[PDB]
Structure formats: structure tokens, C-alpha cells
Design a protein around this ligand. Structure first.
Ligand SMILES: CCCCCCCCCCOC1OC(CO)C(OC2OC(CO)[C@@H](O)[C@H](O)[C@@H]2O)[C@@H](O)[C@H]1O
Ligand SMILES: CCCCCCCCCCOC1OC(CO)C(O[C@H]2OC(CO)[C@@H](O)[C@H](O)[C@@H]2O)[C@@H](O)[C@H]1O
Ligand SMILES: CCCCCCCCCCOC1O[C@H](CO)[C@H](OC2O[C@H](CO)[C@@H](O)[C@H](O)[C@@H]2O)[C@@H](O)[C@H]1O
Ligand SMILES: CCCCCCCCCCO[C@@H]1OC(CO)C(OC2OC(CO)[C@@H](O)[C@H](O)[C@@H]2O)[C@@H](O)[C@H]1O
Ligand SMILES: [Mg+2]
Ligand code: NA
Length: 223
């Protein structure tokens, strides 16, 4: 059937759902491979982060979408790793597509991460285990800052902020390495490593340009 949902990416080894539900006074977290156990949180009056790792499980993605009222067109986008980053506003929910690097001491993998803010839930969809969101998990666990007091829109902002922070750290590491090569480090191979890094840097740099543009120009317009 043409309408068949297809995962377009290359990761198929992991599957797991992690739920963190909290309010100013409490917090409960669990991991499960049973999707039926996370569906009840749909109607939660308090914020719930539902992190679905392994979107190759198109059956799980479809079940979550059907229960939460996600449009099939959005499930196609979640499953298509060639989507562009975006924020899109549906009558009853916000849909966001992001990209995220996974780091390990060149070379660096890229993975798409989608978010849906619906009612009081942030649904997160990842391709494989491993992400940049631990700082947010810890602030929830240990009741740091104000995240525990705020609603699910703040959870959404906090997760995006964690990804922004990761990119800025990543650009800093890329710059420190280019420097190391530029002033140090036989010569012909050293130069081609540099090229590799300056290209990766060119890929990430637009994020900083978009953010700096918003930061500089919006606030005064708001006044
Ligand atoms: C649209 C909805 C969602 C929006 C979410 C909000 C996005 C927030 C972006 C801001 O994060 C940063 O704030 C800085 C200041 O402008 C940074 O400079 C800095 O980077 C550091 C972190 O390593 C520290 O050395 C200092 O805080 C230093 O000011 C930079 O790191 C960056 O991470
Ligand atoms: C990268 C950019 C991302 C931008 C994200 C934008 C976030 C938008 C959410 C803000 O507005 C809302 O916040 C709620 C909790 O999350 C609400 O609960 C609600 O408020 C109501 C009563 O006023 C009713 O409409 C419903 O019960 C509804 O769920 C409702 O105010 C909703 O519109
Ligand atoms: C604050 C939010 C982010 C700010 C900074 C934005 C950084 C640049 C974003 C662009 O990323 C992409 O560019 C495409 C196209 O321009 C993609 O679609 C596509 O997939 C391809 C490659 O994956 C292309 O070959 C196709 O033409 C097709 O359009 C897609 O992969 C996506 O990753
Ligand atoms: C407000 C926060 C917003 C955060 C989101 C915006 C991030 C800015 C874009 C940077 O990340 C990319 O998107 C890809 C798709 O995930 C890439 O494709 C890739 O580049 C390659 C070429 O070497 C392959 O090796 C990789 O596997 C991979 O598919 C990756 O290079 C880079 O273009
Ligand atoms: Mg689409
Ligand atoms: Na991941």
C-alpha cells in the first residue's frame, strides 16, 4: 500500500520508551518497551516527557500517533530523516523537527529528533539510544532551576535549549581543533583533516547565525 509508513533512516538496533512525569511536588520516571503503558499519560494534567527511541518501529510510532491524534502526514515527517528543521503549528499541537549530533572523541553521527507538544505532553522521537538531553533529565530528577514548576511548553523550550548548548559546545571543540592544526600539528595529511573540520563547521554555523539574528533583532521590535 502506498500509504504505508516507512522509516527512511539507517538505525534499527534500539527500541525503548522513557517516561518522566512531574509537577512542583513530585516526579516519576520509568523505561518500557510496552507502548500501551505510556498512552495513559496523554490526558495527564501535569507535564510528561515521553521519549520514544527507535522510530524504525513504525508500528509503535503509528500507535502513538493514532492515540494522540497526530496527523498521518506528521508521522511521515517524523519517519523521514531528510526533513528540514522546522516548527509547524497544528490546531491542537506543535510539531518540531531537529537534528542532533552524537559525539565520540571526526567522526560524528547525525540523527533526526522530532518533538510534539500536545496537551501537557512532549512526545520525543529519536532514531537510536544516545542524546544531549541528560542535563534536562537531571534538573527534573533533582529539582534544579524552575523546570519542575513550569508547564510542558517550558519542557519543550528546555529540551531545545539543551540541543542549542550542545551545538555551541561542539563548535567550540571544532574551533579548538582547527587551531591545534593551524598552528601545529607529514604536512599534506594535516591540511586535509582541517578541510574536514571546516566543512563540518560550515554545516553547523547557520544555527548560530539564525540564533544570533533572532537575539539581536527581535527584542527591540518587541519594544
Ligand atoms: C525558540 C524556543 C526555544 C528557545 C530555547 C532558548 C535557546 C537559548 C540559547 C542561549 O544559550 C546560550 O547562552 C549564551 C549567552 O548568550 C551562551 O554563551 C556562553 O556559553 C557558556 C556555556 O558553555 C558559558 O561560558 C556562558 O554562559 C557564556 O555566556 C551560549 O553558550 C549558549 O549556550
Ligand atoms: C519553537 C517554538 C515552539 C513554540 C511553542 C509554543 C507553545 C504554545 C503553548 C502555549 O499555549 C498553551 O499552553 C498550554 C499548556 O501547555 C495550554 O493549555 C490549554 O489552555 C486552555 C484554556 O485556556 C484550553 O485552550 C486547553 O485546555 C489548552 O490545553 C494552552 O494555553 C495552550 O494554547
Ligand atoms: C533554528 C533552526 C535551524 C537553523 C539552521 C538551519 C540549518 C540548515 C538546515 C537545512 O537542513 C536540511 O536541508 C535540506 C535541503 O535544503 C534537507 O531536505 C532534503 O534532503 C536532502 C539531503 O538530506 C536534499 O538532497 C533534498 O534536496 C531535500 O530538500 C534536509 O536534509 C535538512 O537536513
Ligand atoms: C534550535 C536548535 C535547532 C537544531 C537543529 C539545527 C541543526 C543545524 C544543522 C546541522 O546538522 C546536520 O543535519 C544533518 C541531518 O541529520 C546532516 O547530514 C549528514 O551529513 C553527512 C555527510 O558527511 C553524513 O555523514 C551524516 O550521516 C548525516 O546524514 C549533518 O551533516 C548536518 O548537515
Ligand atoms: Mg512531509
Ligand atoms: Na538518539
Amino acid at each position: 500500500p502506498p500509504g504505508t509508513l516507512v522509516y527512511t533512516g539507517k538505525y534499527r538496533e534500539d527500541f525503548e520508551i522513557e517516561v518522566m512525569n512531574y509537577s512542583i511536588e513530585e516526579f516519576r520516571e520509568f523505561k518500557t518497551t510496552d507502548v500501551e503503558s505510556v498512552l495513559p499519560f496523554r490526558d495527564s494534567s501535569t507535564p510528561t516527557w515521553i521519549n520514544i527511541t527507535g522510530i524504525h518501529r513504525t508500528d509503535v510510532v503509528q500507535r502513538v500517533g493514532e492515540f494522540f491524534g497526530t496527523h498521518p502526514l506528521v508521522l511521515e515527517d517524523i519517519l523521514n530523516v531528510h526533513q528540514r528543521p522546522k516548527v509547524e503549528f497544528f490546531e491542537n499541537y506543535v510539531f518540531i523537527v531537529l537534528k542532533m549530533f552524537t559525539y565520540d572523541k571526526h567522526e560524528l553521527e547525525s540523527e533526526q529528533v522530532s518533538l510534539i507538544l500536545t496537551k501537557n505532553c512532549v512526545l520525543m522521537f529519536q532514531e537510536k539510544i544516545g542524546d544531549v538531553f541528560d542535563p534536562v533529565r537531571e534538573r527534573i530528577r533533582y529539582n534544579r532551576g524552575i523546570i519542575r514548576k513550569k508547564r510542558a511548553d517550558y519542557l519543550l523550550y528546555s529540551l531545545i535549549d539543551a540541543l542549542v548548548d550542545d551545538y555551541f559546545v561542539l563548535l567550540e571543540k571544532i574551533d579548538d581543533e582547527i587551531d591545534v592544526l593551524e598552528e601545529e600539528v607529514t604536512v599534506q595529511r594535516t591540511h586535509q583533516l582541517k578541510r574536514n573540520l571546516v566543512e563540518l563547521r560550515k554545516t553547523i554555523w547557520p544555527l548560530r547565525e539564525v540564533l544570533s539574528s533572532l537575539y539581536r533583532d527581535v527584542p527591540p521590535l518587541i519594544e
